[PDB]
């Protein structure tokens, strides 16, 4: 194949012009869809908070309209999924991974309406879920939509345009273009065979998507953490230890989310009426916790700067950790549309912060700031749970702009992803696709 | 297929423990080798200036001991290559790329001494070449060395251990772990078929190498540029245009580097004595320009902060650009051991800065800083010539720490890599492997 290679080497990086322009319009559409989705989620959270004001005297009526206002939106979201689009449940990254394997359909005429309005209800009701779940699946289907509409043919166009939409979808959820592309390259591409995904086209779509976000979001950053301290070489061993803690919790946490998928299914059996009513209690719990303990609910982006600034007591951090583990499993394992990605950043931040508070008092000669361990732990659950460490590290980097911590961030991620392997854990997204593909055969 | 897939998913990310520990020792050795390599270059550059002081009175003897001291070191490097390790010439990235394709041998018993000491002569004499060339090849061979010593078998260990050594070698040349790993993923892995390169092992080897670098290099950064301004949305179109200029210049520059390899070959025919004497003249030219106009010589890292702060006049910048285009081709195309990667960073910075000075005067309503285009152009030749845009962006980011420019950096890189394609260019490293493998069947 030496002569074969010479032909391929000389023909490298010749993506068809048709794919490039179509990736441009995909990114433009995915950005707008992600912007509109976020504006919708925020607008519903306002009304819910503004409604609690009109009833701030009758505290029982207060706690009641908190539960009900969120249960309705939650139920509305569950119903739209069970009735019209079952593969819009949970995150949606496993489905997009399947679609790239050519093993799951992109029913875009169904998912785009369902997932969009479904997420608005679950996310807008204050459930512990992330926008990236929705926006990645929405962006993937949108890439399929322009493939069908414009009838472009070939394996390249089918895999490329699906990939750029999914990358543009993650970028627009975090304002993180570099992390968007790494997600496709490291986690979502078919892991066991070659593919024709054009990287240059994924770039175009991520640019257009990122520009669309900046037109409607500039001057305000998702996570502002300031400039933290640096990391001396004699401190690195402390970050390796933090990763080893994440390496044992990662798989343990993956078991629970999978295990609770099963247990909550026992509750409703699969019945569209019992199921939607089950999601109404979880969604009402969150809108209630959203008032009586905000840090136990929501995506968790608000508590990340607070935790990194050492503004939480050790007690609260342990409290917040348990609470948010519970509310995250209950919400994600229940089947609501929405990601588990963003809530896992909050868990890593909180857990990291606690480790730093202990380390600060054990080693005063190191002159530590607990915040640096919060930043190193932020992307460590990602590395331990979904096993995409290169995506988490550069994603966290893009959101906190503290490059001087690249070495402890990288060491913490390796300790997590090494100890998850050696303790027999699986990549969560790969383990969900696996179970989906195993029931779509055991039905024969 | 759906049967096979479910089995593969449940067994994903289970790198053999034997491969992981060996990747750790690979990075540890590559870091020390790359550290020692840079210390060697600096020690030799020291002597050259201290010699010019003892002879700073006889300006004619001054200019001569500058030429002679550098010609000898250059000749020593050219000689070591032609005599004992012919595939240790030039960059070495095409050689390691071939090895991952299983189409080129890793003669580590030959290359490690040759490339190491060969580079000391070429790099230490002040030639326009980068440290990354050596350290990637040196780092790849070192990964092969521990595969052989410990007799590990399989395609995985052979492809992995070779890959982590090359990534660990790039990290240690730039203090850039993220750029090291991305380079394997985007440019150097076999581009047309699946491979068993384990990413987790490349990580371990990159860490250990970077830790080794930080132990002997802390508190001082390769390139310190400070915090530049941000880039407003209505200014972005200026960065797309800058990439478009890089997109047409990229292939034109690829022609010259390939073309001057041919033209310089006519001079010596292939004879180790005419060749070494030619390399002695190119290595001597640089040691002269290195004193009478330093920005025309060297890797170019020193002129990047000066250029980025707008401290050069427009007149000087164009000179530097032209001069450094000449000395870069003459040095890399001659076959000397050393990279062309870093000198292309200086070319992008210089070119961007000049473009920025025009933008400052054409659009005063934008309140621009020329430095922001220098940062966006720094990795733009990388995007147009070697066609590794994701690696250039993250490498420049890691060395300049100006993340607020990520969007203009990406727009400049895309314009470059889009217009290089549409003007009929090829990835240089892939095109050098192509010409190398085409002589191996004729």
């Amino acid at each position, epitope marked *: 194949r030496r002569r074969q290679l010479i032909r391929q080497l000389l023909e490298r990086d010749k993506t068809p012009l048709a794919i490039l322009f179509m990736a441009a319009v995909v990114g433009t559409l995915v950005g707008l869809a992600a912007v509109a989705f976020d504006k919708g989620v925020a607008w519903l959270q306002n009304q819910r908070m503004g409604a609690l004001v009109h009833t701030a005297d009758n505290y029982p009526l207060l706690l009641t309209v908190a539960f009900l206002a969120s249960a309705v939106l939650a139920m509305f979201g569950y119903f739209l999924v069970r009735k019209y689009a079952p593969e819009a449940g949970g995150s949606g990254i496993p489905e997009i991974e399947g679609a790239l394997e050519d093993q799951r359909p992109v029913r875009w005429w169904r998912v785009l309406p369902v997932k969009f309005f479904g997420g608005l209800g679950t996310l807008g009701g204050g459930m512990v879920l992330g926008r990236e779940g929705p926006t990645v699946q929405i962006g993937g289907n949108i890439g399929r939509m322009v493939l069908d509409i414009f009838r472009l043919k070939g394996d390249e166009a089918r895999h490329t345009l699906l990939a750029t939409g999914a990358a543009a979808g993650l970028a627009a959820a975090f304002n993180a273009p570099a992390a968007g592309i790494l997600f496709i390259i490291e986690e979502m591409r078919p892991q066991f065979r070659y593919t024709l995904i054009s990287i240059k086209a994924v770039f175009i779509g991520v640019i257009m998507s990122t520009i669309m976000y900046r037109i409607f979001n500039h001057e305000v950053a998702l996570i502002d953490v300031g400039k933290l301290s640096d990391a001396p070489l004699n401190t690195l061993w402390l970050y390796l230890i933090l990763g080893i803690i994440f390496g044992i919790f990662g798989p343990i946490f993956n078991k629970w989310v999978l295990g609770m998928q099963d247990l909550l299914h026992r509750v409703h059996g699969g019945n569209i009426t019992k199921w939607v009513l089950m999601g109404g209690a979880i969604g009402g719990l969150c809108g209630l916790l959203g008032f009586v303990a905000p840090a136990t609910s929501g995506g968790g982006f608000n508590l990340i700067p607070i935790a990194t600034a050492g503004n939480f007591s050790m007690g609260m951090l342990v409290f917040i950790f348990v609470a948010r583990v519970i509310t995250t499993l209950l919400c994600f394992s229940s089947g609501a549309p929405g990601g588990i990605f963003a809530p896992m950043l909050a868990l890593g931040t909180v857990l990291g912060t606690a480790f730093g508070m202990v380390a600060v008092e054990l080693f005063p000669q190191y002159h530590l700031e607990a915040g640096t361990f919060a930043i190193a732990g932020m992307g460590a659950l990602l590395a331990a749970s979904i096993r995409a460490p290169l995506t988490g590290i550069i994603l966290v980097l893009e959101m906190t702009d503290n490059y001087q911590l690249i070495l402890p961030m990288i060491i913490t991620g390796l300790g997590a992803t090494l100890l998850a392997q050696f303790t027999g854990g699986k990549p969560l997204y790969s383990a969900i696709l696996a179970r989906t593909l195993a029931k779509q055969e055991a039905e024969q | 297929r759906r049967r096979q897939l479910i089995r593969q998913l449940l067994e994903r990310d289970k790198t053999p423990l034997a491969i992981l520990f060996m990747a750790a020792v690979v990075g540890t050795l590559v870091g020390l080798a790359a550290v020692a390599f840079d210390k060697g270059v600096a020690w030799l550059q020291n002597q050259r200036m201290g010699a010019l002081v003892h002879t700073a009175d006889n300006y004619p003897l001054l200019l001569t001991v500058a030429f002679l001291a550098s010609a000898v070191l250059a000749m020593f490097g050219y000689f070591l290559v032609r005599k004992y390790a012919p595939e240790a010439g030039g960059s070495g990235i095409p050689e390691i790329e071939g090895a991952l394709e299983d189409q080129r041998p890793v003669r580590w018993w030959r290359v490690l001494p040759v490339k190491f000491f060969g580079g000391l002569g070429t790099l230490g004499g002040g030639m326009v070449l980068g440290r990354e060339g050596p350290t990637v090849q040196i780092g790849g061979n070192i990964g092969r060395m521990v595969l052989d010593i410990f007799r590990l078998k399989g395609d995985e260990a052979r492809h992995t251990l070779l890959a982590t050594g090359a990534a660990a070698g790039l990290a240690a040349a730039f203090n850039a772990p993220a750029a090291g790993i991305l380079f394997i993923i985007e440019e150097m892995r076999p581009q047309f078929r699946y491979t068993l390169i384990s990413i987790k092992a490349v990580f371990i080897g990159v860490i250990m190498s970077t830790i080794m670098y930080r132990i002997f290099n802390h508190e001082v950064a390769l390139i310190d540029v400070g915090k530049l301004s941000d880039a407003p949305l209505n*200014t972005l179109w200026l960065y797309l245009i800058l990439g478009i200029i890089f997109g047409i210049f990229g292939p034109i520059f690829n022609k010259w580097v390939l073309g001057m390899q041919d033209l310089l070959h006519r001079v010596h025919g292939g004879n180790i004595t005419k060749w070494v004497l030619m390399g002695g003249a190119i290595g001597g030219l640089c040691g002269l320009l290195g004193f009478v106009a330093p920005a025309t010589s060297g890797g170019g890292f020193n002129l990047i902060p000066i250029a980025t702060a707008g401290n050069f006049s427009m007149g000087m910048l164009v000179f530097i650009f032209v001069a450094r285009v000449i000395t870069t081709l003459l040095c890399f195309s001659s076959g000397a051991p050393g990279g062309i990667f870093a000198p292309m960073l200086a070319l992008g910075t210089v070119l961007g800065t000049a473009f920025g000075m025009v933008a400052v005067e054409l659009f005063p309503q934008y*309140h621009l800083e020329a430095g922001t285009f220098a940062i966006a152009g720094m990795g733009a030749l990388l995007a147009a010539s070697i066609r590794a845009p994701l690696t250039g962006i993250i490498l420049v980011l890691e060395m300049t720490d100006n993340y607020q420019l990520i969007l203009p950096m990406i727009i400049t890189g895309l314009g470059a890599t889009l217009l290089a394609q549409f003007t009929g260019g090829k990835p240089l490293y892939s095109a050098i492997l192509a010409r190398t493998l085409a002589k191996q069947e004729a």
Partner: antibody
């Protein structure tokens, strides 16, 4: 965030004076600063701008050293020297921090103002 | 330099009226800003980028326009909206302020 300008008052015609605006409450560097003035009961008129590193310094169509704009990022202070001062120079001088949205720049935050009276 | 002219030098309105003031440019300008100067105060950035409100500007204010004509509207004016309003462009260097629109309240 506060801008407190000073140095204004009485100057003989043709003379010169140096106004000073001391900033406080924000990263004073990494911000362009500008001078605007308002004649009595009249409208606003830009005077000049300066970048943090004092490399770029733009003025309104004036003369040589009519206006001289400087800054001291260590004292967090902006300056403005007017020379050959005349009748049309009697006005209220506003110190103003600059910023942008989509990219078209504006006068983000203004100061109280200092008053200059050209008279004998 | 661009000459911005603002439509009424002075206008009166009763609260509940829909006030609208125009800013016209000698040549084409894009994305302009508005400043509110209440009596005895430094000007305050009110509307920026033609139709974006600064933090804390009441939603009864809005901006519009393109190319040559630009307008600032108060849908249901209030007595506290009495001020002089200046438009400003920086899409062309040097930037320029309008002449002001003095808004007086009828009561």
């Amino acid at each position: 965030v506060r801008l407190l300008e000073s140095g204004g008052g009485l100057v003989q015609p043709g003379g010169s004076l140096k106004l000073s605006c001391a900033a406080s409450g924000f990263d004073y560097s990494r911000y362009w600063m500008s001078w605007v003035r308002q004649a009595p009961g009249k409208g606003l008129k830009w005077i000049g701008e300066i970048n943090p590193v004092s490399s770029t310094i733009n003025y309104t169509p004036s003369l040589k050293d009519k206006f001289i704009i400087s800054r001291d990022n260590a004292k967090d202070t902006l300056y403005l020297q007017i020379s050959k001062v005349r009748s049309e120079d009697t006005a209220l001088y506003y110190c103003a921090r600059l910023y942008y949205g989509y990219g078209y720049w504006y006068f983000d935050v203004w100061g109280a103002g200092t008053t200059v009276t050209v008279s004998s | 330099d661009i000459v911005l002219t603002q439509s009424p030098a002075i206008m009166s309105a009763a609260p509940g009226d829909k006030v609208t003031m125009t800013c016209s440019a000698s040549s084409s300008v894009s994305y302009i800003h508005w400043y509110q100067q209440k009596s005895g105060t430094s000007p305050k950035r009110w509307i920026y980028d033609t139709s974006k409100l600064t933090s804390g500007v009441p939603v009864r204010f809005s901006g519009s326009g393109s190319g040559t004509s630009y307008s600032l509207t108060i849908n249901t004016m209030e007595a506290e909206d009495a001020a002089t309003y200046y438009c400003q462009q920086w899409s062309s260097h040097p930037q320029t302020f309008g002449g002001g629109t003095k808004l007086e309240i009828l009561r």
